[PDB]
Design a protein around this ligand. Structure first.
Ligand SMILES: [Ca+2]
Length: 223
């Protein structure tokens, strides 16, 4: 996250870190046994780390649970990043508490102008590299479809939306991928892509989660 703020320990209780020896992507806990992340975050050998603040210190609220199965969306396209979403099942159910909690799935899509909370352990510089140890947060609005398509001609599908600031300075970034965009208490987006980070006229592009709720529910029901 570029141009955000330190969230506070365990204030984003659905935020997960995907670990393969090191943090490499975010995710969102959606029930005791399932995490939603970005398909471009796929790899084998994932350990899900719940209850994190400092990803480099054991602080006492963590739960570390191996993935038993990963499911990339059937129509994910890694060239266009259309359908950039994946489900991870945990080998065991998380113990849910005030600091490890699921985030509600949307029943309706969000609209341009709605404020949202975006979070992660990604890069904090736009012309630089600096990775934080504690979780960073950004409040950002959803942008109109037309301004999104105008910023990124020929690239925005119906499964994407833009959020952030066209002036630049405030965005998600490398290492935030897969993590949450939560608006009025609902998981509306997944950190997906963008040209650089926090560049003028290049807002963040996010997977439109409301399009996938039927897929998520039926997948969970059969797995
Ligand atoms: Ca920790």
């Amino acid at each position: 996250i570029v141009g955000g703020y330190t969230c506070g320990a365990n204030t984003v209780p659905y935020q997960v870190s995907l670990n393969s020896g090191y943090h490499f992507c975010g995710g969102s806990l959606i029930n005791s046994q399932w995490v939603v992340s970005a398909a471009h975050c796929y790899k084998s050998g994932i350990q899900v780390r719940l209850g994190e603040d400092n990803i480099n210190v054991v602080e006492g609220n963590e739960q570390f649970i191996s993935a038993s199965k990963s499911i990339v969306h059937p129509s994910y396209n890694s060239n266009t990043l259309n359908n950039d979403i994946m489900l991870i099942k945990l080998k065991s159910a998380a113990s849910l508490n005030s600091r490890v909690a699921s985030i509600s799935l949307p029943t309706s899509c969000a609209s341009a102008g709605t404020q949202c909370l975006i979070s992660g352990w990604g890069n904090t510089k736009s012309s630089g590299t600096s990775y934080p140890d504690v979780l960073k947060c950004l409040k950002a609005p959803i942008l109109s479809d037309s301004s999104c398509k105008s910023a990124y001609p020929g690239q925005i599908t119906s499964n994407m939306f833009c959020a952030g600031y066209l002036e630049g300075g405030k965005d998600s970034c490398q290492g935030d991928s897969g993590g949450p965009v939560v608006c009025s208490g609902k998981l509306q987006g997944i950190v997906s892509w963008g040209s650089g980070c926090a560049q003028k006229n290049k807002p963040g592009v996010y997977t439109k989660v409301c399009n996938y709720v039927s897929w998520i529910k039926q997948t969970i029901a059969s797995n």
